[PDB]
Amino acid sequence: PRPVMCQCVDTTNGGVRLDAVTRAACSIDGYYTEKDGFCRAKYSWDLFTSGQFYQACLRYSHAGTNCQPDPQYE
Amino acid sequence: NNAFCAGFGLSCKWECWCTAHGTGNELRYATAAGCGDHLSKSYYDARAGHCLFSDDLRNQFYSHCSSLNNNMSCRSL
C-alpha cells in the first residue's frame, strides 16, 4: 500500500475540483495544497486510503473523488 | 431569543441544514461545520443534525452550505 493524493470533485461537468470540499475532507488529517487542490499524506507512513477519502468527500458534498499515487512517496 | 436558543435550542426562529444537490440528502457534517462553535448565537442540534438560530443567520449559513457545493433547507419555527 502506497501513499495516494486526492481531490473531491463534482459528480457532474467532467467532475471539476471542489476545493472547499477537499479542504474540509482533508482536515484523514493530511495537508492541502492550494494551487493544485490535492490533499496529501503528511508522512509516507501516515497515509490515508483512497477509500477513506471518498467517505470524507461524501460527508461534505455530493462529490466523487479523483485519487492518484502521490509522486513524492513513489 | 438568542439566549434561550443558543443555550437550549428554545425560542429559535429558524432551523436550517445543508443538502446534497440532486439527492437532497441531508449532510450533517457540512451542517455541523457551519454551526455551534462555528456560528455565534447558533444552536447545533447534533441529533437531527440541524442548525438553529433566533437572529436571521440564513444568508450567512447559506454561504457555508454553498461554499461546499451544497443547497440549503430551512424551516421557520
Side-chain angles (χ1 to χ4, degrees):
Chain A
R2 316 300 267 103
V4 71
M5 61 189 190
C6 302
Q7 306 177 138
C8 299
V9 298
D10 210 351
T11 57
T12 66
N13 45 269
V16 70
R17 297 161 48 175
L18 298 176
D19 292 339
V21 184
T22 308
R23 173 171 314 113
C26 197
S27 61
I28 291 296
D29 197 30
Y31 74 98
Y32 178 77
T33 303
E34 195 183 273
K35 50 184 178 288
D36 60 40
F38 278 90
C39 174
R40 297 168 166 86
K42 299 182 161 183
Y43 303 105
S44 77
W45 48 265
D46 189 41
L47 79 85
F48 56 83
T49 68
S50 55
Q52 294 173 322
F53 201 78
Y54 181 83
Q55 179 170 358
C57 294
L58 274 183
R59 276 134 73 108
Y60 290 97
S61 194
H62 186 67
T65 63
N66 295 349
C67 288
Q68 52 184 98
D70 184 344
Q72 78 175 317
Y73 298 129
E74 292 186 300
Chain B
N1 180 292
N2 282 328
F4 298 158
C5 184
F8 306 89
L10 304 177
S11 308
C12 308
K13 304 188 171 210
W14 302 106
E15 169 178 10
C16 299
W17 60 96
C18 297
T19 61
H21 76 229
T23 52
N25 294 6
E26 304 193 6
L27 300 159
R28 75 173 48 250
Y29 283 93
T31 299
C35 206
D37 292 331
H38 305 292
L39 185 56
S40 178
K41 305 176 291 170
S42 74
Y43 179 85
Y44 181 57
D45 183 329
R47 195 56 61 184
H50 297 160
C51 193
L52 288 75
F53 33 77
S54 175
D55 289 344
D56 188 352
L57 305 181
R58 284 177 301 173
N59 199 42
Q60 293 84 343
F61 187 73
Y62 174 78
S63 83
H64 174 260
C65 292
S66 171
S67 77
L68 291 174
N69 210 44
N70 298 321
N71 297 137
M72 174 186 72
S73 286
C74 288
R75 303 281 168 256
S76 169
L77 301 170

